[PDB]
């Protein structure tokens, strides 16, 4: 009549780390256009640029929340070992 049956199904999923979404981590306030610094200091080009910076350890924080950490420490603010970057 009107019958379709799922025989195969190849899914695909990304796997993150889950020290939850809850926010960013190194400024914590969701991976939104917030990251703290941009929210207040808004209407500035530096805000219209706020993106996620993916680790290599797979922790990712706003670009800024990390650019601005590195000027100081290089290690990963969540997995001890150093940064590496990749993807924006």
């Amino acid at each position: 009549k009107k019958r379709f049956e799922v025989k195969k199904w190849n899914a695909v999923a990304l796997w993150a780390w889950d020290i939850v979404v809850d926010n960013c981590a190194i400024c914590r306030n969701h991976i939104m256009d917030l990251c703290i610094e941009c929210q207040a200091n808004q209407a500035s080009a530096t805000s219209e640029e706020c993106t996620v910076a993916w680790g290599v350890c797979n922790h990712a924080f706003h670009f800024h929340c990390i650019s601005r950490w590195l000027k100081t420490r290089q290690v990963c603010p969540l997995d001890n070992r150093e940064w590496e970057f990749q993807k924006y």
Partner: protein, 725 residues
């Protein structure tokens, strides 16, 4: 005394035109002198010199003022029989030359020669040479010439090189040769061809000029190995060169060009080798071929046009044609002269990054895209497969084009979003194809460039591994109802994007929860975000009067499993049950409609143009029928490819900004205080290897870098900044 000198001359007068006089004579003559120097005997030389200085004066009397090819038949034989005799005379005066001439603190034979350039300092310096030229003028024809007639002449002036007191002569004597002949030779030789060049120049061919002026140069080289002396050849050549090649360069440049417009190619080799000679000769042909092929390319692609714009094989191919065409020309006709290889490369670079194609697309960056898209079309599961070497080869060709790509970030970035999909879907042509491509690219741009291509790869093997872990976990206390398979990719390493808010149709719940459970047994906290926009699955129909195995996207399966109940839903209805955004449903429903698994109320509606509105019904077409069992209706939106290209390009624009900033800071740190222009300049020096930022973009980054307080302007200075930490 006057005694031996009367009989000594008696013999000396005989030693010349020698009647093969008996050695009895020489023996006498020798000791005749031995004693004459012992009775200082200085006089003897004085007598000898006189005798010589006289005999010749008398000799000159004969053949006197009889230039020519007169002196020819003469000055040769004369110098000849004189030489030998003078030679024999020295052998005789030997005792003289010894104890007289070391007393210095002035040989005879030498005296013989000096004494002869007093036959030279007369007619035989002036009209005889001017005879030789008369014979040499037989460069044109004739024969024959009898080189012997000039050899003697030549070897003479050479020999008469001079010998009035230096002692012996350190370098070649050859002052007389040049000044008495060489000079008078060259000057007269030039006019010959200077007349024949211009003669020919107008009456014969820019091809059949080089062909000749080529040979004659050779001749002139020939006529120096037999009527020489040693370097009158390069000086001779340096000369004939200036007369045949290089005062004729402009008369060659205009011809060279035509030789291109017509693939008349050995005409170019000779065109080259000729100008090859003249110093700084190629400098122009190197600009003509440089700018020439540039056209060919800018044209051959121009023909393709709106097509090439969306046909990578064509675009890249038309390009690899102009290249492989003119490359073999430089390798052939231009003797792979790196200077001409430059011309090629400079031109290829010019028209590969900018041409009718890029212009249409409005950006240099299309080129790398089309080179990306090509490779994918090449590393993608082919309708059959490609021949190993074949692929590997074209893949080595794609890299020749890559070699000229300005926006390699663009190429790379594409070749990445493409490898992603290929990996994600086990849709690669040959695995050793990719593996080679990644290498092929690693070489130029190091591990860093290809790192991500490798991260994705190795990250995929993992998924395969984990998949098994799950396939195994099944024949364990856990059976699955449908063939499940999953790719668990590291949210960080791939270029994907989660998704469009799906609702996971029931028939997939089991497989979701289970594996979601099975993945709990691995990374305590690990999040799985299910990329439904990217997942496969097959469907098997029982409703159509035939068994089709629909190979479909998860969204299609979702909307399709929806027909397992009430039969025809409007769009709103699917965008609620499937929970799949209209914006996305529509395009998918577009597809499902285009394959007639679904058919709208209006049988005339041109699905491929009609617009989907929430209220528009979407009847399941039950009469459906495909010329194939197992139909792959998972070709999503046509437009997707466009938004991909678009969103993927913009994903780069924002990525060059950061790399640019990350340079500014980098530079501003190393320098601390720097002037605008120099800052800008540096930025390029840095980024050239990947892409040439447009000043206005950097200008932007600079400000952003100021806002983000990484560097500021030096209050009280035109265009200056200080690295503020």
């Amino acid at each position: 005394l006057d005694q031996i000198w009367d009989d000594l001359r008696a013999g000396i007068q005989q030693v010349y035109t020698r009647q093969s006089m008996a050695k009895s004579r020489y023996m006498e003559l020798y000791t005749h002198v031995y004693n004459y120097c012992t009775s200082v005997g200085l006089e003897l030389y004085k007598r000898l010199k006189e005798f010589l200085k006289n005999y010749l004066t008398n000799l000159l009397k004969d053949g006197e003022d009889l230039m020519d090819e007169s002196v020819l038949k003469f000055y040769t034989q004369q110098w000849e029989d004189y030489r030998f005799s003078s030679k024999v005379l020295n052998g005789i005066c030997a005792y003289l030359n010894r104890h007289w001439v070391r007393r210095e603190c002035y040989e005879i034979y030498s005296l013989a020669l000096v004494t002869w350039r007093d036959c030279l300092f007369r007619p035989l310096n002036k009209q005889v040479t001017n005879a030789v030229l008369k014979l040499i003028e037989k460069e044109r024809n004739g024969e024959t010439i009898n080189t012997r007639l000039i050899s003697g002449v030549v070897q003479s002036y050479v020999e008469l090189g001079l010998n009035e007191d230096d002692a012996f002569a350190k370098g070649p004597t050859l002052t007389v040769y040049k000044e008495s002949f060489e000079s008078q030779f060259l000057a007269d030789t030039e006019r010959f061809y200077t007349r024949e060049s211009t003669e020919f120049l107008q009456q014969n061919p820019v091809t059949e000029y080089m062909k000749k002026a080529e040979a004659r140069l050779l001749e002139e080289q020939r006529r120096v190995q037999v009527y020489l002396h040693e370097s009158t050849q390069d000086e001779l050549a340096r000369k004939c060169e200036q007369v045949l090649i290089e005062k004729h360069l402009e008369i060659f440049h205009t011809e060279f060009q035509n030789l291109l417009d017509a693939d008349k190619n050995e005409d170019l080799g000779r065109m080259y080798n000729l100008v090859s000679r003249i110093q700084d000769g190629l400098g122009e042909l190197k600009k003509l071929l440089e700018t020439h092929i540039h056209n060919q390319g800018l044209a051959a692609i121009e023909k393709c046009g709106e097509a090439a714009l969306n046909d990578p094989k064509m675009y890249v191919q038309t390009v690899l044609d102009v290249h492989k065409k003119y490359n073999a020309l430089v390798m052939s006709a231009f003797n792979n002269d790196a200077g001409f290889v430059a011309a090629l490369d400079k031109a290829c670079g010019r028209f590969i990054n900018n041409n009718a194609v890029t212009k249409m697309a409005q950006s240099s960056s299309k080129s790398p895209e089309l080179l990306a898209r090509y490779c994918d079309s090449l590393l993608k599961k082919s309708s059959k497969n490609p021949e190993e070497a074949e692929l590997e080869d074209t893949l080595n060709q794609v890299m020749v084009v890559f070699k000229y790509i300005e926006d390699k970030d663009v190429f790379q970035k594409f070749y990445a979003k493409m490898l992603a999909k290929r990996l994600v879907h086990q849709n690669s042509a040959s695995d050793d194809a990719e593996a080679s491509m990644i290498s092929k690219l690693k070489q130029a741009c190091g591990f860093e460039y290809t790192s991500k291509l490798q991260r994705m790869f190795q990250d995929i093997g993992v998924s395969k591994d984990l998949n098994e872990q799950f396939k195994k976990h099944l024949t364990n206390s856990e059976p699955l109802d449908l063939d499940f398979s999953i790719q668990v990719l590291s949210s960080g390493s791939w270029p994907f994007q989660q998704s469009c808010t799906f609702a996971l149709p029931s028939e997939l719940e089991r497989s979701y929860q289970r594996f979601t459970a099975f993945y709990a047994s691995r990374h305590s906290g690990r999040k799985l975000t299910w990329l439904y926009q990217l997942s496969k699955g097959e469907l098997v129909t029982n409703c159509f009067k035939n068994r089709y195995t629909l190979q479909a996207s998860t969204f299609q399966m979702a909307i399709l499993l929806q027909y397992n109940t009430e039969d025809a839903y409007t769009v709103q209805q699917l965008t609620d049950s499937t929970q799949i955004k209209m914006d996305i449903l529509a395009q998918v429903l577009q597809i499902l409609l285009k394959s007639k698994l679904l058919v709208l109320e209006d049988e005339n509606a041109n699905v491929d143009e009609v617009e989907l509105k929430p209220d528009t019904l979407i009847k399941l077409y039950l009469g459906y029928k495909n010329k194939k069992l197992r139909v792959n209706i998972n070709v999503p939106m046509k437009t997707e490819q466009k938004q991909e290209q678009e969103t993927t390009h913009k994903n780069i624009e924002e990525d060059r900004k950061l790399l640019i900033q990350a340079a500014i800071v980098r530079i501003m740190k190393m320098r601390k205080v720097l002037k605008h222009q120099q800052l800008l300049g540096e930025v390029l020096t840095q980024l050239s290897s990947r892409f040439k930022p447009r000043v206005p973009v950097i200008k932007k980054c600079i400000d952003i870098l100021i806002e983000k307080e990484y560097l500021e302007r030096v209050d009280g200075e035109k265009d200056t900044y200080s690295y503020l930490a």
